[PDB]
Amino acid sequence: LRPSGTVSCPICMDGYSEIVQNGRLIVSTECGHVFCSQCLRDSLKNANTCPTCRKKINHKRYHPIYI
Amino acid sequence: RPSGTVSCPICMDGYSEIVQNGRLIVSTECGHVFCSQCLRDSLKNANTCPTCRKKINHKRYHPIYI
Numbered sequence A: 001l002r003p004s005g006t007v008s009c010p011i012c013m014d015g016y017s018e019i020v021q022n023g024r025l026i027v028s029t030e031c032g033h034v035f036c037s038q039c040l041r042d043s044l045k046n047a048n049t050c051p052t053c054r055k056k057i058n059h060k061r062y063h064p065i066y067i
Numbered sequence B: 001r002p003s004g005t006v007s008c009p010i011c012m013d014g015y016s017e018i019v020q021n022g023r024l025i026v027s028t029e030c031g032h033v034f035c036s037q038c039l040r041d042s043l044k045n046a047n048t049c050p051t052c053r054k055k056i057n058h059k060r061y062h063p064i065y066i
């Protein structure tokens, strides 16, 4: 069960209390999707995308300039 | 290499040599300038600015304190 209004990780399926009880943080992507710190971390070792919506959540900080 | 010269510190090509074969001039956010080809290469197996070593990979997630 995953009652609406509750904050849990869609990957490990832990609730808010379980996530914080062992030192993990609640995190959010810029695209608004919530995970525990540890599952999003593993996930991003091997992708630039949000587990939930697949939108890229990296930002190589460089860009063309047009002199 | 006088001030105002636009060139790549990696391949050593100047602004004309860069645009003539289809590369773009680029800049990291720390203000460092490369050709698009050399910078891109450097970032395949690394995530730092080839010039100053600052991390230039901004993964867009953060803690929320509830």
Ligand SMILES: [Zn+2]
Residues within 6 Å of the ligand: A009, A010, A011, A012, A013, A014, A035, A036, A037, A038, A039, A040
């Ligand atoms: Zn989790």
Ligand SMILES: [Zn+2]
Residues within 6 Å of the ligand: A029, A031, A032, A033, A050, A051, A052, A053, A054, A055
């Ligand atoms: Zn997302």
Ligand SMILES: [Zn+2]
Residues within 6 Å of the ligand: B008, B009, B010, B011, B012, B013, B034, B035, B036, B037, B038, B039
């Ligand atoms: Zn170059």
Ligand SMILES: [Zn+2]
Residues within 6 Å of the ligand: B028, B030, B031, B032, B049, B050, B051, B052, B053, B054
């Ligand atoms: Zn730099």
